[PDB]
Amino acid sequence: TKAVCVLKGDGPVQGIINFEQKESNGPVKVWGSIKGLTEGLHGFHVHEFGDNTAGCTSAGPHFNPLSRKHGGPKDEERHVGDLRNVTADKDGVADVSIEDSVISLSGDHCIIGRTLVVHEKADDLGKGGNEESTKTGNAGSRLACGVIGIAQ
Amino acid sequence: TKAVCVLKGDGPVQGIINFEQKESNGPVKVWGSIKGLTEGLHGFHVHEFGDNTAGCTSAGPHFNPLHVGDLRNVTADKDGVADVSIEDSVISLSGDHCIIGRTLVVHEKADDLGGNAGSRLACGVIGIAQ
Numbered sequence: 001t002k003a004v005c006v007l008k009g010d011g012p013v014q015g016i017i018n019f020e021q022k023e024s025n026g027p028v029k030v031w032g033s034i035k036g037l038t039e040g041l042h043g044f045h046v047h048e049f050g051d052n053t054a055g056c057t058s059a060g061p062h063f064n065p066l067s068r069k070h071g072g073p074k075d076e077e078r079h080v081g082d083l084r085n086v087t088a089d090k091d092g093v094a095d096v097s098i099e100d101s102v103i104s105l106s107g108d109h110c111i112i113g114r115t116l117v118v119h120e121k122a123d124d125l126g127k128g129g130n131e132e133s134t135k136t137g138n139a140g141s142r143l144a145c146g147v148i149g150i151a152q
Numbered sequence: 153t154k155a156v157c158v159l160k161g162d163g164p165v166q167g168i169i170n171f172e173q174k175e176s177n178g179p180v181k182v183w184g185s186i187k188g189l190t191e192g193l194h195g196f197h198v199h200e201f202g203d204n205t206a207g208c209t210s211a212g213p214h215f216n217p218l219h220v221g222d223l224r225n226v227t228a229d230k231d232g233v234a235d236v237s238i239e240d241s242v243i244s245l246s247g248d249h250c251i252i253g254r255t256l257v258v259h260e261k262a263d264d265l266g267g268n269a270g271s272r273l274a275c276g277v278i279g280i281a282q
């Protein structure tokens with residue numbers, strides 16, 4: 001399977017992110033770039049709904065089919081949608097090259113038809129000592145998003 | 153099971169289309185509106201790929217896993233608005249005819265039902281809704 005997402009938002013933030021899974025239960029490669037970002041770390045998650053009728057707001061919460069706590073490290077408790085942080089350079093460009101073992105593009109709990117979101121602030125990966133850390137990672141507002149679609 | 157699609161293009165054509173399927177073995181209800189169209193019939197199809205990196209062009213061909221994406225035509229009234237109210241039992245929101253993650257496209261011309269529908273005016277990726 002291959003998938004793709006066009007990220008867009010109100011601001012200068014935009015990008016394209018590609019997904020590829022060679023085998024049914026194989027790792028998913030996630031790669032592309034996002035620009036218009038402030039230099040530094042930006043939270044990066046799959047959200048539950050592929051509903052962009054009210055912008056990124058209508059995407060709902062982090063995609064969490066197992067009803068677990070927010071995280072990031074793929075070897076510890078997380079939402080399925082938790083993809084940690086992207087890092088923007090001095091020119092505001094975040095080149096993305098990730099391999100994730102928890103998301104999938106087929107079978108149970110796949111992310112096709114859901115929304116990819118890039119955030120205002122860094123994701124604390126559920127490591128903070130506050131309630132918000134366990135829910136959102138304190139990544140703040142949604143800067144750009146798009147629906148994840150099947151690609152050729 | 154519910155889905156939604158925001159149709160956009162590089163012209164005036166735009167709309168929102170909703171999909172609801174209460175039963176996995178039953179019909180999908182398709183409803184919404186599209187504005188900015190020329191009066192008359194317009195091709196209305198699910199295309200294979202939910203790839204909008206090149207606008208509607210990257211959506212690929214008419215969706216056909218066997219066409220399954222054959223939703224026929226919408227009718228734009230004289231004010232350029234098409235009211236969409238469709239029940240289709242060929243498309244699905246689950247299983248093998250699943251259209252989630254694919255692209256809904258509205259066309260310049262009428263689908264002659266056998267498809268000569270012309271340019272892709274607006275499109276969007278079909279996403280899971282609450």
Ligand SMILES: [Cu+2]
Pocket residue numbers: 043044045047062117119139
């Ligand atoms: Cu998020």
Ligand SMILES: [Cu+2]
Pocket residue numbers: 195196197199214257259267269
């Ligand atoms: Cu078509």
Ligand SMILES: [Zn+2]
Pocket residue numbers: 045062069070071078079081082135136137
């Ligand atoms: Zn999370």
